[PDB]
Amino acid sequence: MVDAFLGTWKLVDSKNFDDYMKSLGVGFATRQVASMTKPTTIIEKNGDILTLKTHSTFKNTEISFKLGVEFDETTADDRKVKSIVTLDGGKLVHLQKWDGQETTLVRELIDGKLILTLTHGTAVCTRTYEKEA
Numbered sequence: 001m002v003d004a005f006l007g008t009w010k011l012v013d014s015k016n017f018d019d020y021m022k023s024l025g026v027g028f029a030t031r032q033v034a035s036m037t038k039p040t041t042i043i044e045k046n047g048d049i050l051t052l053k054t055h056s057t058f059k060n061t062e063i064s065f066k067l068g069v070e071f072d073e074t075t076a077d078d079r080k081v082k083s084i085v086t087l088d089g090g091k092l093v094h095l096q097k098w099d100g101q102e103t104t105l106v107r108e109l110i111d112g113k114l115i116l117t118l119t120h121g122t123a124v125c126t127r128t129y130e131k132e133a
């Protein structure tokens with residue numbers, strides 16, 4: 001199920017992150033810092049509890065969740081959202097809801113790389129992560 005996602009991942013490419021951040025209403029000064037940042041994502045499991053850490057020189061987040069169980073999340077850009085993470089077609093789909101809006105964060109393994117697709121409104125961002133061993 002989730003075991004191929006587990007580990008430490010480092011960003012190696014990013015397309016259209018600015019467009020996604022603009023769509024969410026992130027201010028120009030935070031978008032500048034975010035365009036140069038190369039986060040590390042750590043995904044860990046303990047039984048049926050996942051933990052997802054995102055580390056960087058700018059901002060750090062951590063969430064723990066069970067698949068298929070809604071949780072409260074405060075995002076890096078300070079949205080208060082209702083979240084759920086599920087396995088769909090082998091992808092890890094994270095849906096965030098707030099104020100009648102949605103965004104999806106979809107993680108898929110392709111050729112040993114982690115591809116993160118971020119959709120909000122018309123904005124689509126693809127991030128590519130490589131595994132640190």
Ligand SMILES: CCCCCC(=O)O
Binds near residue numbers: 041
């Ligand atoms: C608004 C949060 C963006 C997360 C982007 C990433 O994990 O690469």
